[PDB]
Amino acid sequence: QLLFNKTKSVEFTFGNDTVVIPCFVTNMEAQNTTEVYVKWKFKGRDIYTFDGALNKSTVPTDFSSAKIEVSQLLKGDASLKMDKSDAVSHTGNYTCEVTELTREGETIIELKYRVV
Amino acid sequence: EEELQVIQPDKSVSVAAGESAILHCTVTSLIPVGPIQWFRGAGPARELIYNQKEGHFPRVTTVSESTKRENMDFSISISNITPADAGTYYCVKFRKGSPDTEFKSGAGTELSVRAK
Ligand SMILES: *[C@@H]1O[C@H](CO)[C@@H](O)[C@H](O)[C@H]1NC(C)=O
Numbered sequence: 423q424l425l426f427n428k429t430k431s432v433e434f435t436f437g438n439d440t441v442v443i444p445c446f447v448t449n450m451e452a453q454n455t456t457e458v459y460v461k462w463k464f465k466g467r468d469i470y471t472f473d474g475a476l477n478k479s480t481v482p483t484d485f486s487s488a489k490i491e492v493s494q495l496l497k498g499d500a501s502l503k504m505d506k507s508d509a510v511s512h513t514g515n516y517t518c519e520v521t522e523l524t525r526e527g528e529t530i531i532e533l534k535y536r537v538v
Numbered sequence: 539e540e541e542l543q544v545i546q547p548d549k550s551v552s553v554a555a556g557e558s559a560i561l562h563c564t565v566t567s568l569i570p571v572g573p574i575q576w577f578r579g580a581g582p583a584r585e586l587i588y589n590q591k592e593g594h595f596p597r598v599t600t601v602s603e604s605t606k607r608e609n610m611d612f613s614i615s616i617s618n619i620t621p622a623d624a625g626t627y628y629c630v631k632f633r634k635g636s637p638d639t640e641f642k643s644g645a646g647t648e649l650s651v652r653a654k
Pocket residue numbers: 432433434435437438440441442443
């Protein structure tokens with residue numbers, strides 16, 4: 423497996439212009455991003471994917487702001503970034519799934535919105 | 539270069555009830571990118587027995603250190619065998635996608651269970 427440095431939850435308020443949902447693999451050994459695949463899932467849907475072999479990111483139109491920083495994958499960082507509009511209407515549990523060659527793993531993080 | 543092979547060297551395995559079963563599988567390549575999974579049976583009603591995701595298969599783990607990038611051994615151990623576990627077990631390579639697709643199957647290993 424790919425193993426994760428786990429986080430139970432992250433929180434944001436009206437004050438956040440964007441949000442980050444952390445995802446960190448602790449035993450990544452990738453030499454090139456072509457070897458890597460990432461899926462972020464919400465309520466059973468793939469709301470962000472990165473197919474390294476094609477250098478291709480894919481999001482649905484209701485998560486149009488979702489992205490990762492592809493350059494950080496080789497360090498094991500697959501953290502999701504989105505704008506506050508996509509975030510405030512889609513609070514809940516996010517699954518980060520990473521694959522490197524044949525090794526795979528996933529971790530879950532709850533995105534929580536605090537009303538102030 | 540040669541095609542990826544999924545090799546299940548044993549056509550059959552016999553286990554005494556209560557013992558652990560070892561089902562062998564190796565791959566000859568780690569690309570194309572995608573996981574290995576084990577099933578009992580084939581076709582649309584087959585049962586997922588193992589993949590590398592943490593906390594899903596309390597009876598099943600890999601024999602070798604499959605947390606290493608270079609690992610090509612996907613052999614598994616299943617604890618506490620009962621007659622209910624008898625069947626044909628397949629080691630299956632997938633390619634990544636939305637959703638993942640079956641790429642190549644091993645030949646299958648028939649597990650027979652010996653009562654009392
Ligand atoms: C929201 O902003 C705060 C304050 O800068 C920060 O600490 C927190 O990590 C942000 N939350 C998310 C989910 O990005």
